[PDB]
Enzyme design. Structure first.
Site, short mmCIF file in Angstrom:
data_model
loop_
_atom_site.label_atom_id
_atom_site.label_comp_id
_atom_site.label_asym_id
_atom_site.label_seq_id
_atom_site.Cartn_x
_atom_site.Cartn_y
_atom_site.Cartn_z
N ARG C 61 49.51 7.73 6.73
CA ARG C 61 49.28 6.31 6.53
C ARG C 61 48.64 6.07 5.19
NH1 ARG C 61 44.93 2.35 9.52
NH2 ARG C 61 43.77 2.64 7.56
N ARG C 108 36.29 -9.68 0.64
CA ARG C 108 35.38 -8.60 0.31
C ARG C 108 34.28 -9.04 -0.67
NH1 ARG C 108 39.00 -3.24 1.62
NH2 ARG C 108 37.10 -2.60 2.73
N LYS C 258 49.74 -5.76 13.25
CA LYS C 258 48.40 -5.33 13.61
C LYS C 258 47.63 -6.49 14.19
CE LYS C 258 46.20 -3.21 10.56
NZ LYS C 258 45.64 -2.64 9.31
N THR C 316 41.45 3.01 15.08
CA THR C 316 40.09 2.90 14.57
C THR C 316 38.89 3.44 15.36
OG1 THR C 316 38.87 0.70 14.75
CG2 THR C 316 40.97 0.59 13.62
#
EC number: 2.7.1.40
Lengths: 519, 519, 519
Positions: C61, C108, C258, C316
């Site tokens: 990935r 972010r 996702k 995760t």
């Protein structure tokens, strides 16, 4: 080797359950399925009626297709005479319900004044004309046959079939006249007088409740009958019609619709909603729809009724060979075992008791078979599937009922005692199918009679005055129920029993449960 | 509205499944349950035998209780004459099996030389002496009755009951002599000659295979019968005894034990192990054990057999009113629907075909009912429960079978085609109860005859020579099976069909599966 | 003691199944759950990448939140270098898929030019202003914090919470300015640069596919990536948007949405419909919705995906302690066992492989746990429940699949071989959850790479030219699959194997099945 089929009772799968059925696993003394007997010449005797009561007859049925009101009143009279002859010992007294089986949109043959004729043997391929002209109304013969239904020519097509004498005789409508039909005997055989005619595929415009019907029902209210078996219900309105004739004075008479046509199968759901119970009238249903289909209609109706909490009665020709023989056929014994296994609340005896040679023998057989099939049920799976059917309800008595029935399964209770007056509470317990008998103690008489419609309820009438102290009153009834269970041999001192009663005088429903040993 | 009961087929619970049964959901043309007809005076005709073949008769049964070998050979002859009259069109040819129903440890009444006597009406409470002294062997009458069983006095207790004429007549053993029994007619009724006698609770020391038996069986091998219906099996040795008489030349004749006593119910498991299939002989079983218990014994045996992969035949009095009437009772229609629902591989017609008025009508009824009950099964639940019953086996054909039957369920295959010679492979598919017909193509004739014992197999005989190329040979047989399915109307061009065949000439079993549309 | 949990496999109830789990029941050599590894500094080495391939890494990935296209191309380059170093032995060659994990609507933190500051430790109750004014864009510090999302002031309410550094830090929006927010440090802790910010309950108007996104994806098509892990899918259109950017040249790249917000949970069904598979992105989902709720969202999505036939990846923090430690926690081992038990097709390693100390150890652990949980599944119940979920479909490959998977269960096949090029067929088998591995032989390369998304498929690339004779071609591939299974130790000569292949060259799907022993 367990008893009462407890081994098969423990199976994980239905196939396992079947593999485990043991003919050496004795059932219990109690029989939960109600036996309904059709009263006739072979059973109108008060003496034979006591023997029938002692043999497990629960509801006496009165077919109003035949007989005079005078004849019926005397039947109700005798039935009552015999029921009350036991009224002396309240512990051994058994209330018997009385049911008025209505004469529906019935088409019947005329009279055969062809009296010289030993047997009016009809033969294949022959011709036979059917006349509405009522001059031959009594001069019926192999050549000319008269009938009830005056609008038959409007209903039938040239090519249709006509069924007489319980569809045993079939006629092809070869030609059609303005007021007659030239038919051909497809099925030869001897025809009698007043036989019933069925027009499968025909739109019979006859009414559900006729003038005759209006009178029989009004006599029904008057003679204080418990339930009504209404013939040929095609829809929910028919039921409202039957209901309206009973009025306020008939407010408590339970209306049981009889599904005996295709429409009533189609409209079934609407009918069930509107009725107090249902009857799978195999006789006409099996002439109205293809006989091969009947078992389908029966299981669908019993399952659906079982699902909803409404009594369902499987009927007609269950032990019929016993009209002339003292033992049923192998096919007849399975027919009865399978109706109980199917979940039928009540099973019925008609010709077998009405005018058969073996009235009592027939009764005891249904009793025997019923007792054994009840043990062969798969209660665990049945209760789970029943609990799930109900999913949408949060009803408290339903909860007490499920809980009680679940507790009985675990501790293997000898019975369940329900103190009820209106009957609603005992009804709910019976609906979740416990394995043990449900002794229903009540001071209400109609309640105890009509509790026969429900699988498992053994009604008991309390003939004692009411006690000032509710508790004393409660224990008074609970001991009544105990002394009865012990007299009947359902349980003995030391056995465990689940008891459902109201907390305080005005409880609304049976909201208290105890697990008590039998004193 | 789906067809063939696919709606009820989707239910999550058995109760849901029942609630969803629709009398307007037409089944499929194919009928999977095998009909076995008892051949008698009413059906020995080659003409009536063709009509019976065209009506779905599959196995002709020969009751060796009665008749002379000469009489039977001519029956086998006619049966063969009629089966082969269709041999012309291989696509429309139907192999019919022949079954030798043995005369077991049968006790029968003597002859009533009391010929002046119109009907030897026996009356209740009367007395009747039973003599072994064979001077009255033919002078049987209401007062003196002679019988077969010479050791009856040793077996019975004063107080026992004796059942004559299919238990219709019951006698109480009031007194016992050295070679006679003074009995009392408990159940009055007219007794005939050579009637059968049952001694419930008595230890009959008669042998399973007698001299007569040894001869009938040896004639059976000689006339090349397919299966043997052996009467009164009490244990696994009885089966080994019957087997030993057939020897090597009878190596392929299938022995079907008939459980018709209590011992055979007790010893059932050992018997099943040793037999090729089982027969629930309701007649004697229902006189040997309490009639109320019979349905238990039946379901236990059908479930157990279904569990093991062995054919099981439900028999006796299934449509019996049809001996004299053209339509069965409501109880008789449910008896048949419930045997198919029970899982019976084959159902049987006896008096209904042997000497009844309505041979053909009876046949078509079993056909009709069978077709409808087969649709009313709960395949999903049944297959899961069946898959689980088998848990312990890792067998490859069983795997191909489960897999095939599972695939058919998903894609709703019109049928399953199995190329088999020995029959083992088609047998395994039939055992996991697919919903679609199993067309079994074989060049083996005994195989095709005997494949009738199994639910679902529609045997087909391939009359073409073998092809040099295995593939060609395979496709030759697959088209045969397709042209047949299309001629019979089981499926039409475009429909999907699962096909089970061997990879290469010596495959051992049907190890290749394809999902092919019908050309 | 059976192996591979066959004992618990035989249970009738889930509770029985649990009670029967044995830590002495060795699993099989094959592991069916696909391991996805996030490539980072700790694993970009071709040498470490071979070790990772030998350790079971299946899909590499690439998180596009970070890195330059140049950095990624070299990663794809190395990944390809290592995969192909084994290309030499086709029996030991393992195709590895490459996945582009998109940078979504990511907010972010700015840069902390407060470089003198060893650790910008934020303390509880303190205040901190958040500025959009990009002058402090690089001068981030404990007092002034700059961020990406320019429309944050419009989205937040005074009173809202802001989550930085994976929600580890929580800020209360105390005051709101026109282009800043005076917040209070609810959760003190050291904050770094470029950390991610989550606004639970805020309506982030950022787009699913941005300009950056449009470029990363177009580089994705160009570098010929197999699948795309698209971040923050809120609806079915987002998926159509991602799809449109890939165009025709990206026609075969599998889009995996996702679900990492509340909207995507809400709109889940619509998303599943439109995607090629789903990813349960526990990270953000667990900051976006209450962490206590996460397990609910996960099981609902895995069950639903399992129901529909779409791959689902649990992700995760599965073995996160292993970033610094060589052994996971007790909580981490159950997290992995439960995702496989939950039905997750693929499980993922992120920080554990990206920049952790124990890249390989982490891989082998997921491998170990996966292998054992796969044995602890309740296949029987799972397949029944899966078969039922599908009820409405009559699809032929689904039928072949169910049938094949059912046959494998019965005979305990060592594996299932599926000859496929497009992959559809092997996908269907994997969907009905067989217990044995599914060896997928294909000559298509993207197919073999992308078959990793599905539970159970062990893809194998056939590097031989096509044979003139279809049969030869088929057997060529079947031996390839056999030599591989034997080299990998999945089965040995004599073991049984189910084989699914096409009848003739243009079969449409895998419509032929055989049960063959391993040569």
């Amino acid at each position: 080797i367990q008893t009462q089929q407890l081994h098969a009772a423990m199976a994980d799968t239905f196939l396992e359950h079947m593999c485990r059925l043991d003919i050496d696993s004795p059932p219990i003394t109690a029989r939960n399925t109600g036996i309904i007997c059709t009263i006739g010449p072979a059973s109108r005797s008060v003496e034979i009626l006591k023997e029938m009561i002692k043999s497990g007859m629960n509801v006496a049925r009165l077919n109003f297709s035949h007989g005079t009101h005078e004849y019926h009143a005397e039947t109700i009279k005798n039935v009552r005479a015999a029921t009350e002859s036991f009224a002396s010992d309240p512990i051994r007294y058994r209330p018997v319900a009385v049911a008025l089986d209505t004469k529906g949109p019935e088409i019947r043959t005329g009279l055969i004044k062809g009296s010289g004729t030993a047997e009016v043997e009809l033969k294949k391929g022959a011709t036979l004309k059917i006349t509405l002209d009522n001059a031959y109304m009594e001069k019926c013969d192999e050549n000319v046959l008269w009938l009830d239904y005056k609008n038959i020519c409007k209903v039938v097509e040239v090519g249709s079939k006509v069924y007489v004498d319980d569809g045993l005789i079939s006629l092809l409508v070869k030609e059609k006249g303005a007021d007659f039909l030239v038919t051909e005997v497809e099925n030869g055989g001897s025809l009698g007088s007043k036989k019933g005619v069925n027009l499968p595929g025909a739109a019979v415009d006859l009414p559900a409740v006729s003038e005759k019907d209006i009178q029989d029902l009004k006599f029904g209210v008057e003679q204080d009958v418990d339930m009504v078996f209404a013939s040929f219900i095609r829809k929910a309105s028919d039921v409202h019609e039957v209901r309206k004739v009973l009025g306020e004075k008939g407010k408590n008479i339970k209306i049981i619709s009889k599904i005996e046509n295709h429409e009533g199968v189609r409209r079934f759901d609407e009918i069930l909603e509107a009725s107090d119970g249902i009857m799978v009238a195999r006789g006409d249903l099996g002439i109205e729809i293809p006989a091969e289909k009947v078992f389908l209609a029966q299981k669908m109706m019993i399952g659906r009724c079982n699902r909803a909490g409404k009594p369902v009665i499987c009927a007609t020709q269950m032990l019929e060979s016993m009209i002339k023989k003292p033992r049923p056929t192998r096919a007849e014994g399975s027919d009865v075992a399978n109706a109980v296994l199917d979940g039928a609340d009540c099973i019925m005896l008609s010709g077998e008791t009405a005018k058969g040679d073996y009235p009592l023998e027939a009764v005891r057989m249904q009793h025997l078979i019923a007792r054994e099939a009840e043990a062969a049920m798969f209660h665990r799976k049945l209760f789970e599937e029943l609990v799930r059917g109900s999913s949408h309800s949060t009803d408290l008595m339903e909860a007490m009922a499920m809980g009680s029935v679940e507790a009985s399964y675990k501790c293997l209770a000898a019975a369940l005692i329900v103190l009820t007056e209106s009957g609603r509470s005992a009804h709910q317990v019976a609906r979740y199918r416990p394995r043990a008998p449900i002794i229903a103690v009540t001071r209400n008489h109609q309640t105890a009679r009509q509790a026969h419609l429900y699988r498992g309820i053994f009604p008991v009438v309390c003939k004692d005055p009411v006690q000032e102290a509710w508790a004393e009153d409660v224990d008074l009834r609970v001991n009544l129920a105990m002394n009865v269970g012990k007299a009947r041999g359902f349980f003995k001192h030391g056995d465990v029993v689940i008891v459902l009663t109201g907390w305080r005088p005005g409880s609304g429903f049976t909201n208290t449960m105890r697990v008590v040993p039998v004193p």
